[PDB]
């Protein structure tokens, strides 16, 4: 190892593993000369104060005699600047005295220094570093306690048997990560993890919860602090080639830094951020030059801790007082940008500690330092439980304890598996077989000190864990500033929630977070804006133009009080009045009475076939044939071959045909539906041929009888050409009955029945005129 | 470490890592007492002879002075019974003297033993074990040479910098694994890998090649030697719940053993096997009790090797000669099932070596032992190149070599990166930056010694690697015995290659290895048995009943020589003969000549409208109207009001109407298509109303003229009721022309034209009879 160490002697050595530099240099060895270790060129003041938080509690235990009397404590602490290489290079020296059973060819000085073996060890930050170092110490059962390693792979106790945490596991952070977008009500998001044991398994767990809550994922990407610049530009083009305003960033501190500088050069705005706790308080990331594109940044953190005298101990520093710190002189030079020696100028070693801005001392809270501060205490308190072994009631076979002068790491781990004691601020730190405890999380926003631009972290709520699901989370939303200032919550669903008129269809391949919306046709009336399917209307309605609630009814094919038909009804009334005047002339000055009365009935027949149709109004078309067949009695009575009341021989035949037809054909108005929107009509639905047979048996039978009896009398003037007038009236009635047929066969609705009505009225008026006017006016 | 070691002193220590036991015991430590290492209860004679192959070549280098004179060689070899735990427990003692710069608190005896550091080390078998141990030695650049670790993760030189192989990599085995089922012509298979660094990445590479060659995968499963018995039953139920006769097993030796015993209890047969080379020669697996369900087992292996004196050295064994072997006495007791000491009886230490069946000595070839035997030599030959450093032309800065008494592992690795020398049997072992070489593979079958039942491994070909793709592989298939004895190659496609009549459709979700097949309808004629889609027929064909090549033609609606129409044509000929007899009587004993001639033309008119239709045969229906209008001249000439040659006044009108119609309507036979299979007809397609207008203007005009001229003469007998006969003939012709209309309007094809033909013939025959017979017979 180097001189870069932290070591004081003592009865039991502890040692620790700490990131004094974020990034390592990455030189390529070439084997032409003697290879050597690599200097790691970055810094972490938070790591240096983590060292201070270690050694302060160390000296607390040494000074306090209530905590392990007659026992000075050693340590041999090394820097692991985020490489498993130097982590292994350190921990091989940790597995040293236990290798005396393996390396025993040093017999002449095998107990010269007589070193106590490093009994336990404070772990390391990065999950990859801890998983690398855990496999070695699982062999010797040397208990290793991490403080920041927070991946669920280490919860396995098959491989990692000698591993404990003073930090909660990651499943609850994945749970709250699902629940925050649940409460924030989104379905469409893309995430970015780190390509190691911290990012990948936790983002896999978040993928589990995302498909539990049916939240579709845009993308899942991986970066590191050694990522390729083309790959960073590639994933940035992936971001700009897609759309999800929220992003689950689930990485450590310095791994985002190249991507972050690249993005602030790329000047992408609008996308907002979700933070894992490994970078949710990242001072090197939290910079006001980056607060244009970061901000509104929501994350989690641990609760604060309290250490007495600690700020004073942090300013109890001096480079020629670093008898147990190799890193302190380099820290002094690096803070003061100079070159002390026993470009960069000299250093006086006497400057003010609280003079310059540094995250070493300009903190607000104690979280991971607090975890270390209680971690070394929990080691010491399990050790204290060994120190007061109950005489015969230890944690061994038969409770048979051993001495404290010869204590072994497996005994230490056995007592560490059952350690039931409480905090200095009164919290029972108690280990399950997951090797940790669990606490709550704060929930912050990256706000801004507006006059200074220092990115402040306002608590906007928290996440309890001690409740159950659907119950653990509370956010006061009333201090959230989305995109740093916008009070309104933004939009991150993929497809828009469409309006009322278009029902929400589905695209193949893409799930429910991004759909399509299609306006259904022809009776759509889709009322709700976000129902996936619409309904079809009932009978009395048709769709709106904007396909809203269908109210447009059907047709009104009745022509009852229609102005086109009312004038024809008035003309029929005038014809009836002319017939009344002719009968009044015939009365004042069988053919005289009944031929006039049956003609009046044939005139009044079609007037009972007008209006909105019904049962009786439908069956009243049979009297339009019967009264015309009765009015044809003059055509048989007034022939030149003129017992006269024997018109019953055809009247009863027509009546019997109608009595059969009343049960054969339908005497009921038939409301058909020909069109779609306006289709309400009435057409009476006669049976198959009943009306045609009755018409052929009455009308064109009596007219043909009159024509066959007057074919000889047409060339015969008698009673002032009354035979000529009768033949002309018979021809006119036959012409009207012939012309009414195709206009009934080629029509519909209110265009069909009016033709038959007007034709019957016209034929009656013509025959009545050609008889009565030529009779009377002379 | 234990006494279970292999150690002789020497100037440079080497050491190795070897599986003396397949499985370890898996006791759970409970920390109530002193924990300790676990005894591993299995054995591997192949591992023991691998130790022998190490130490024999070691003593060869020591005895040979041409190979490194004045240099005895140490070793410190340990057993790694397939656990990374004991592998690490070994290799911590390997990184020992290099830790003097780290552990320097042993100053009073830091050079007492003055141990030379273990300069290089022969690696280990299992890929997980080698990847575990490689990360440690990559730090110190101690070159480690494996011999069996064959995963492509170790081809990376970023992490594993100090790693070399004397075994080819796995990409070519995955390539040949794709090519063997390519040549064996399958598309549907399910695989089983081992759940570690050997199985998983290679089976991932095979998945790449499977989707390259478009070979769909049934399943990809993972087992170990610590698999769950319910999981083994679960994957066996997965096998029985699916179907693929070939199985890519891609694991080590003992990991299949629980699954294999479970399967031979489960008694699944029919499935055949593909072997990776890690178990393709697995003697503990190759058992005759298992050769019922295994057999036909195809795999790969390395070529054999040759070591002189080696069989004698293997039988140069004695337990009280094991001065550098801790495992040898246990090997002696384990072979002889006894208990030597200085139930199981005593051991004499003097039994015959070649007395019992054991895979220690009952081998056939040298493959991995050969790899070790050349591996230690390649270490020694790079060391020899260091020994004759060219004075100033080494592999350093300026070629500046160092001494052999103080040699470092980075110098050794530098010379190992450039080592260009040849085998004892003359093959240039030369390392690229993949840290290996590449050789061919044999391709075997697990045959049977039929009288002894020992599963013999007949070579059934090989796999060259030095060619390119599509070129590297040759199999003589003529010794393959599928399922151990069946000469025919079996079937493992998912869906069957269907017959000709059903075109191959596609199922959603499942790719081309498993499809559907559907018989297309209505002109299918799908000729090829394995074309995905069919075609539709040309016009002159319709489909077969079994939907094969469509040959069934269309209809023959001509009725030219039809027996139903030939009798009617003969009746028309008899009517023409009767007309000829009547004209002969009228000649022997205008109406006399032309009314007979035009009647003969009207008789012969329809006879030119019979047969298969054509242009002139289609236009010959106009003469059927013209000659009938000419034959109606008697109806105007023979009236009772009887200049006579003025029939031209209507003949020219009919001719001008026909001359207009010849250009108006189509004078061409119209082959319609009404049906589907048999639809070939002829219907002449007249224009819109031309034939109807010409018929109304000629036929029912002349007949109505005759009727209006004879309505008074019907009650007038003259010339023996010739007026009555003429009126009856006119009524008959009008009745025939009226009856021919609906039978033409409601028919088709050969049912329509024959009606008009027979009606014209009947009307002509009736009119000619009613004139001529009543004229002549009196
Ligand atoms: C974004 O989409 C989600 C679902 O994809 C919407 O959540 C639904 O909201 C409606 C009313 O807002 C609720 O009745 C549903 O129960 C919610 N879905 C689920 C699964 O609970 C969310 O409203 C959408 N937000 C925006 C702004 O479009
Ligand atoms: C973790 O969060 C919970 C929040 O549910 C805290 O519970 C509070 O406990 C105090 C003391 O009993 C109560 O007065 C509060 O009403 C609780 N808050 C609730 C119910 O919302 C709890 O203190 C937090 N810390 C720990 C260590 O459990
Ligand atoms: C199993 O299926 C494969 C393909 O899924 C078949 O291989 C095809 O065979 C035909 C003729 O046998 C060739 O014309 C094709 O070129 C082959 N396909 C490819 C992709 O090359 C194979 O014949 C099938 N075997 C059985 C027994 O069904
Ligand atoms: C690897 O396999 C190839 C097979 O392609 C072997 O090549 C043979 O080489 C000999 C010697 O030159 C020729 O006589 C043969 O005709 C080759 N076989 C062919 C072309 O099929 C080769 O020997 C094998 N071994 C090595 C180490 O390359
Ligand atoms: N939990 C992280 C370590 C970590 C937590 N907080 C951090 C802050 C900075 C750097 C690393 C961390 C891991 O598993 O790797
Ligand atoms: N290649 C194997 C090791 C191996 C090769 N052949 C073997 C035979 C038996 C056991 C193991 C092996 C691995 O990577 O793990
Ligand atoms: C970055 O985007 C913001 C958003 O409008 C814009 O105001 C600013 O000018 C941009 N800066 C650069 C350098 O493109
Ligand atoms: C009592 O203790 C001794 C030594 O600690 C041990 O050997 C013995 O098994 C124990 N007996 C019981 C019953 O625990
Ligand atoms: C031991 O743990 C239990 C858990 O409920 C707790 O009640 C008890 O107070 C603990 N004992 C001590 C001494 O703290
Ligand atoms: C195993 O299957 C074979 C295949 O037919 C059969 O002959 C044999 O009897 C079976 N054995 C058992 C134990 O089921
Ligand atoms: C020559 O060798 C010395 C020592 O080996 C070295 O320092 C020097 O750089 C070398 N010069 C060249 C040009 O290689
Ligand atoms: C070195 O390698 C080359 C590679 O082609 C070979 O030709 C040559 O023979 C090798 N040298 C020796 C000494 O074997």
């Amino acid at each position: 190892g180097p001189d870069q160490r932290a070591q004081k002697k003592g009865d039991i050595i502890l040692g620790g593993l700490f990131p004094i530099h974020f990034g390592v240099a990455a030189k390529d060895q070439d084997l032409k000369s003697r290879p050597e270790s690599v200097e790691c060129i970055r810094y972490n003041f938070r790591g240096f104060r983590w060292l201070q938080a270690m050694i302060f509690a160390i000296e607390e235990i040494n000074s306090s005699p209530a905590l392990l009397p007659n026992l000075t404590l050693g340590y041999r602490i090394f820097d692991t600047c985020n490489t498993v290489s130097k982590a292994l290079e350190a921990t091989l020296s940790f597995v040293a005295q236990n290798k005396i059973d393996s390396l025993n060819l040093d017999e002449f000085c095998n107990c010269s220094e007589h070193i106590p073996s490093t009994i336990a060890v404070v772990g390391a930050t990065g999950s990859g570093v801890s998983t690398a170092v855990a496999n070695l110490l699982g062999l010797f059962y040397i208990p290793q306690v991490s403080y920041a390693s927070s991946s669920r792979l280490l919860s396995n106790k098959n491989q990692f048997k000698s591993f404990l945490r003073t930090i909660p596991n990651d499943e609850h952070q994945a749970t709250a990560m699902a629940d925050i977008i649940e409460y924030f009500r989104w379905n469409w998001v893309g995430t970015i993890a780190a390509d190691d044991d911290y990012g990948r398994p936790g983002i896999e767990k978040f993928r589990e919860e995302a498909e539990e809550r049916d939240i579709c994922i845009d993308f899942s990407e991986l970066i590191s602090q050694y990522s390729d610049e083309e790959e960073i530009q590639h994933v940035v083009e992936v971001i700009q080639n897609s759309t999800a305003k929220v992003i689950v960033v689930f990485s450590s501190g310095p791994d985002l830094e190249p991507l972050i500088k690249e993005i602030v050069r790329r000047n992408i705005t609008g996308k907002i951020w979700l933070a894992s706790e490994a970078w949710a308080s990242s001072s090197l990331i939290a910079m006001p030059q980056y607060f244009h594109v970061v901000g509104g940044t929501i994350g989690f953190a641990l609760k604060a801790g309290q250490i007495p005298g600690f700020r004073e101990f942090l300013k109890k520093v001096h480079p020629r007082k670093s008898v147990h710190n190799g890193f302190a002189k380099e820290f002094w030079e690096e803070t003061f940008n100079c070159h002390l020696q026993e470009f960069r100028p000299l250093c006086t070693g006497d400057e003010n500690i609280s003079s310059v801005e540094t995250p070493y001392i300009d903190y607000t809270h104690l979280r991971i330092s607090y975890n270390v501060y209680l971690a070394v205490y929990s080691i010491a308190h399990a050790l204290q439980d060994i120190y007061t072994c109950l005489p015969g009631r230890g944690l061994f076979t038969n409770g048979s304890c051993a001495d404290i002068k010869k204590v072994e790491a497996w005994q230490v781990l056995k007592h560490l598996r059952h350690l039931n004691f409480t905090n200095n601020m009164g919290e029972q730190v108690t280990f399950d077989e997951c090797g940790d405890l669990v606490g709550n999380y704060s929930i912050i926003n990256w706000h801004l000190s507006p006059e200074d631009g220092s990115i402040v972290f306002k608590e906007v709520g928290y996440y309890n864990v001690y409740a159950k699901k659907g119950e653990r989370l509370f956010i006061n939303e009333e201090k959230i500033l989305w995109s740093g200032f916008s009070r309104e919550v933004p939009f991150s669903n993929c497809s828009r929630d469409c309006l009322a008129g278009t029902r929400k269809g589905i695209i193949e391949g893409e799930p429910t977070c991004c759909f399509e919306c299609v306006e259904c046709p022809d009776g759509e009336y889709s009322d709700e804006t976000d129902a996936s399917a619409c309904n079809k209307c009932p009978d009395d309605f048709w769709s709106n133009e904007n396909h809203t609630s269908c109210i447009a009814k059907e047709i009104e094919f009745l022509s009852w009080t229609e102005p086109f038909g009312i004038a024809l009804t008035l003309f029929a009334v005038l014809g009836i009045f002319l017939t009344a005047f002719v009968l009044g002339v015939f009365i004042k000055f069988e053919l005289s009475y009944l031929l006039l009365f049956s003609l009046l009935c044939c005139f009044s027949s079609s007037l009972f076939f007008i209006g909105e149709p019904q049962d009786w109004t439908c069956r009243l078309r049979q009297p339009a044939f019967g009264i015309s067949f009765v009015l044809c009695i003059s055509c048989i009575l007034v022939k030149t071959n003129r017992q006269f009341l024997l018109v019953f021989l055809c009247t009863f035949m027509q009546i019997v045909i109608c009595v059969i037809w009343l049960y054969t054909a339908p005497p009921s108005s038939y409301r058909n539906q020909e069109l779609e929107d306006e289709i309400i009509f009435i057409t009476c639905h006669e049976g198959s041929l009943m009306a045609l047979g009755f018409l052929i048996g009455y009308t064109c039978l009596l007219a043909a009888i009159c024509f066959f009896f007057a074919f000889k009398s047409r060339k015969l003037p008698e009673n002032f050409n009354e035979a000529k007038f009768i033949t002309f009236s018979m021809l006119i009635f036959f012409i009207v009955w012939i012309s009414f047929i195709p206009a009934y066969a080629s029509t519909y609705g209110k265009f069909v029945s009016a033709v038959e009505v007007i034709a019957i009225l016209a034929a009656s008026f013509g025959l009545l005129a050609c008889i009565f006017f030529n009779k009377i006016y002379i």
Side-chain angles (χ1 to χ4, degrees), chain A residues 1-20 23-26 28-38 40 43-78 80-97 115-183 185-186 188 190-230 232 234-236 238-275 277-319 321-328 330-339 341-342 345-496 498 500-503 505-507 509-511 513-518 520-521 523 525-526 529 531-534 537-538 541-544 546-548 550 552 563 565 567 572 575 580 584 611 613 616 618 623-624 626 665-667 684 687 691 693 697 703-704 710 717 723 742-743 745 749 754 759 762-763 766 769:
Chain A
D3 204 13
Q4 300 323 109
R5 75 168 47 231
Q7 167 198 338
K8 175 210 278 294
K9 335 281 181 157
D11 314 314
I12 292 162
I13 316 168
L14 273 303
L17 290 314
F18 296 98
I20 69 161
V24 75
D28 204 314
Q29 288 301 137
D30 296 333
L31 308 98
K32 62 184 181 295
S33 87
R34 170 72 145 274
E36 82 285 348
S37 178
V38 182
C40 49
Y43 197 74
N44 188 26
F45 296 100
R46 179 67 184 271
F48 198 86
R49 82 188 210 206
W50 281 335
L51 269 306
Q52 308 324 107
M54 184 162 182
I55 56 189
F56 199 33
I58 285 174
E59 201 36 67
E60 186 264 3
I61 303 153
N62 288 287
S63 89
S64 55
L67 197 48
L68 276 305
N70 287 332
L71 270 161
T72 172
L73 273 301
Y75 46 86
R76 192 169 70 243
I77 312 170
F78 294 102
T80 73
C81 44
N82 286 318
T83 70
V84 292
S85 72
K86 305 187 193 280
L88 263 296
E89 178 259 338
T91 185
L92 59 91
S93 65
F94 290 161
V95 48
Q97 320 302 129
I115 314 162
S117 201
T118 319
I119 279 297
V121 55
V122 166
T125 67
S127 278
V129 178
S130 47
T131 52
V133 81
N135 318 289
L136 291 93
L137 321 163
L139 315 168
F140 294 91
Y141 321 105
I142 293 185
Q144 169 254 329
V145 282
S146 197
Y147 46 86
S149 318
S150 80
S151 158
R152 52 147 163 85
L153 318 167
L154 299 104
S155 64
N156 174 39
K157 294 287 111 178
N158 307 325
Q159 308 174 357
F160 323 105
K161 53 194 76 61
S162 47
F163 179 69
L164 312 161
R165 292 179 178 176
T166 76
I167 172 164
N169 214 358
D170 214 13
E171 314 304 279
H172 299 290
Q173 204 186 5
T175 318
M177 267 323 285
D179 293 12
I180 179 173
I181 41 169
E182 188 44 67
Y183 166 89
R185 299 276 315 272
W186 282 311
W188 170 249
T191 179
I192 287 159
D195 44 9
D196 72 294
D197 291 333
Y198 174 67
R200 303 196 257 96
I203 206 57
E204 198 45 65
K205 180 56 175 42
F206 183 54
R207 200 208 55 82
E208 311 314 287
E209 305 319 287
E211 293 330 287
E212 282 191 16
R213 261 68 153 161
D214 206 356
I215 302 171
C216 55
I217 287 177
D218 196 7
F219 44 81
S220 88
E221 313 304 306
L222 293 176
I223 60 165
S224 88
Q225 77 166 340
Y226 308 125
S227 315
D228 210 330
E229 298 84 28
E230 51 88 17
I232 297 151
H234 170 73
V235 71
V236 152
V238 158
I239 290 151
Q240 301 153 309
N241 276 315
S242 179
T243 171
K245 293 208 199 95
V246 298
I247 287 167
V248 182
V249 172
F250 193 73
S251 45
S252 82
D255 305 329
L256 300 162
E257 284 277 345
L259 167 73
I260 292 307
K261 297 187 212 46
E262 182 263 359
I263 283 174
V264 303
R265 198 209 29 84
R266 284 292 300 165
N267 205 68
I268 309 174
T269 57
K271 302 302 181 179
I272 71 169
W273 311 104
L274 271 302
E277 46 196 326
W279 76 289
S281 44
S282 40
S283 70
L284 75 161
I285 280 285
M287 290 185 166
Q289 319 95 24
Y290 310 149
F291 204 67
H292 311 267
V293 306
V294 79
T297 315
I298 314 297
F300 308 91
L302 207 61
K303 53 191 57 52
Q306 295 312 302
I307 307 178
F310 188 42
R311 183 73 67 91
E312 299 86 349
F313 176 69
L314 291 152
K315 58 187 179 291
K316 262 174 53 180
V317 285
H318 182 260
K321 295 302 178 178
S322 42
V323 294
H324 317 307
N325 200 301
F327 323 101
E330 182 264 350
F331 162 72
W332 201 271
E333 283 201 15
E334 203 277 331
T335 44
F336 296 137
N337 302 112
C338 54
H339 165 237
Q341 208 55 49
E342 308 164 350
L346 267 296
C347 311
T348 183
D350 301 321
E351 311 93 325
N352 176 34
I353 296 148
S354 316
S355 44
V356 64
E357 210 288 320
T358 171
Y360 172 69
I361 210 157
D362 301 330
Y363 64 97
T364 71
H365 309 316
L366 308 178
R367 275 82 169 267
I368 310 299
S369 40
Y370 183 49
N371 292 314
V372 181
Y373 169 75
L374 63 98
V376 55
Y377 284 170
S378 50
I379 300 153
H381 278 283
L383 184 50
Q384 182 70 270
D385 177 42
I386 306 155
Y387 190 83
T388 173
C389 272
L390 214 49
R393 304 297 182 90
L395 277 183
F396 292 84
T397 174
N398 217 331
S400 44
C401 271
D403 67 312
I404 316 295
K405 276 81 62 180
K406 197 59 66 187
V407 56
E408 297 167 316
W410 61 268
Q411 315 166 0
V412 173
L413 187 47
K414 178 60 177 177
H415 280 55
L416 266 161
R417 184 171 289 174
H418 312 87
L419 172 68
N420 183 23
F421 88 104
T422 182
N423 208 344
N424 71 329
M425 56 183 70
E427 283 89 6
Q428 266 291 332
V429 283
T430 52
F431 284 130
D432 49 352
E433 282 328 287
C434 317
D436 66 326
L437 283 85
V438 58
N440 298 329
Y441 304 88
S442 155
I443 293 190
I444 76 164
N445 193 302
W446 284 25
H447 270 102
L448 197 77
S449 83
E451 51 88 18
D452 278 335
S454 43
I455 302 175
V456 299
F457 304 136
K458 301 304 291 321
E459 170 183 358
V460 197
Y462 74 104
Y463 178 73
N464 178 36
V465 63
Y466 299 89
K468 73 176 190 55
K469 57 192 60 52
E471 191 189 52
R472 264 155 203 165
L473 176 56
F474 165 69
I475 309 108
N476 163 265
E477 64 199 13
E478 282 305 311
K479 274 84 73 181
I480 307 186
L481 279 193
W482 320 86
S483 56
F485 47 85
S486 157
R487 174 75 238 174
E488 49 88 22
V489 50
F491 175 78
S492 197
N493 279 349
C494 177
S495 88
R496 310 282 332 192
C498 54
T502 76
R503 55 100 176 171
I506 53 170
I507 303 287
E510 185 71 29
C513 55
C514 206
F515 46 84
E516 63 175 353
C517 277
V518 47
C520 39
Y525 84 110
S526 59
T529 173
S532 192
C534 68
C537 296
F541 305 102
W542 210 245
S543 45
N544 309 353
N546 48 1
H547 292 237
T548 323
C550 54
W616 34 270
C618 180
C684 269

